[PDB]
Design an enzyme around this catalytic site. Structure first.
Site, mmCIF file in Angstrom:
data_model
loop_
_atom_site.group_PDB
_atom_site.id
_atom_site.type_symbol
_atom_site.label_atom_id
_atom_site.label_comp_id
_atom_site.label_asym_id
_atom_site.label_seq_id
_atom_site.Cartn_x
_atom_site.Cartn_y
_atom_site.Cartn_z
ATOM 1 N N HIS A 59 2.641 4.122 12.009
ATOM 2 C CA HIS A 59 1.360 3.712 12.930
ATOM 3 C C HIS A 59 1.332 2.114 13.423
ATOM 4 O O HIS A 59 0.969 1.827 14.230
ATOM 5 C CB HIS A 59 0.427 4.500 12.441
ATOM 6 C CG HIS A 59 -0.806 3.624 12.725
ATOM 7 N ND1 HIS A 59 -1.318 3.816 14.222
ATOM 8 C CD2 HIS A 59 -1.720 2.607 11.957
ATOM 9 C CE1 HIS A 59 -2.696 2.833 14.218
ATOM 10 N NE2 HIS A 59 -2.752 2.238 12.979
ATOM 11 N N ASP A 102 5.754 9.419 9.585
ATOM 12 C CA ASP A 102 4.484 8.723 9.163
ATOM 13 C C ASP A 102 4.847 7.433 8.511
ATOM 14 O O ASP A 102 3.980 6.281 8.597
ATOM 15 C CB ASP A 102 3.931 9.375 8.090
ATOM 16 C CG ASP A 102 3.320 10.878 8.508
ATOM 17 O OD1 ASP A 102 3.057 10.980 9.798
ATOM 18 O OD2 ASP A 102 2.994 11.832 7.747
ATOM 19 N N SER A 193 -3.317 -0.465 6.507
ATOM 20 C CA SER A 193 -2.289 0.571 7.132
ATOM 21 C C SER A 193 -0.977 0.203 6.554
ATOM 22 O O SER A 193 -0.765 -1.182 6.841
ATOM 23 C CB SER A 193 -2.450 0.704 8.440
ATOM 24 O OG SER A 193 -2.477 1.852 9.043
ATOM 25 N N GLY A 194 -0.230 0.944 6.088
ATOM 26 C CA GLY A 194 1.213 0.589 5.868
ATOM 27 C C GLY A 194 1.201 0.044 4.420
ATOM 28 O O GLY A 194 2.420 -0.204 3.635
#
Length: 243
Positions: A59, A102, A193-194
């Site tokens: 993402h 993902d 995120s990540g």
């Protein structure tokens, strides 16, 4: 500055009962990556798993397919005024995981210099299942952003329990894992995120999870959902060795 998963600055190890987590001791999470656009703006996290490889969330790569659009900041502690000897490296290539999609691997144009401020996280053995209630940490800049690198201690919650009807109700795939608290508990939204979810295995930290935006962060009445790294290890190694 050698073996994966062993910081040269020992982690503070924020107790689970602290709200909002703790400021990390500088360089105590040496694999922590800051993902930025060419214009140098932090918008995601990632984990150094090899001198030339960074594992992050797919993402994070949604706004561009061009590997040159991304910069990897290693060795950092502050979010804005970057430390003097922070390594800043252009990504040469992107590899999106193909089944779930993902997570992604970023290849660095130049290898990272491994120092006592920049060291890789260890990968788990294939299909390993982190046990219920194992204590792990999530780190990152919460992206107001945190400003300084933050950490929080979250207990894993086995999928079978996390998937219960009254909780996440079947929506956690076997290629994901949960961490945090079912009811009650502090809001643990310190990761990017990540970013990494590592768990200490008797003498080093193993990357077991990757945080994801569209999934979640650990909230008071809902745990966070992380991509289960052990299920993508053979793929990750395959990409690294053959690329």
């Amino acid at each position: 500055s050698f073996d994966c998963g062993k910081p040269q600055v020992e982690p503070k190890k924020c107790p689970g009962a602290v709200v909002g987590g703790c400021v990390a001791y500088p360089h105590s999470w040496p694999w922590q990556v800051s993902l930025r656009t060419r214009f140098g703006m932090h918008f995601c996290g990632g984990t150094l798993i090899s001198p030339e490889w960074v594992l992050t969330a797919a993402h994070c790569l949604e706004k561009s397919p061009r590997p040159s659009s991304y910069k990897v900041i290693l060795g950092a502690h502050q979010e804005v005024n970057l430390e003097p000897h922070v390594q800043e490296i252009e990504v040469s290539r992107l590899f999106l995981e193909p089944t779930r999609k993902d997570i992604a691997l970023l290849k660095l144009s130049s290898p990272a210099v491994i120092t006592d401020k920049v060291i890789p996280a260890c990968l788990p053995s294939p299909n390993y299942v982190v046990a219920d209630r194992t204590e792990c940490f999530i780190t990152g800049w919460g992206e107001f952003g945190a400003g300084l690198l933050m950490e929080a201690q979250l207990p894993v919650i086995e999928n079978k329990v996390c998937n219960r009807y009254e909780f996440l109700n079947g929506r956690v795939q076997s290629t994901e894992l949960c961490a945090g608290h079912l009811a009650g508990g502090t809001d643990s939204c310190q990761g990017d995120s990540g970013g990494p979810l590592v768990c200490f295995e008797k003498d080093k930290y193993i990357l077991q999870g990757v945080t994801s935006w569209g999934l979640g962060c650990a909230r008071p009445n809902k745990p966070g959902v992380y991509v289960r790294v052990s299920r993508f290890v053979t793929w990750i190694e395959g990409v690294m060795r053959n690329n």
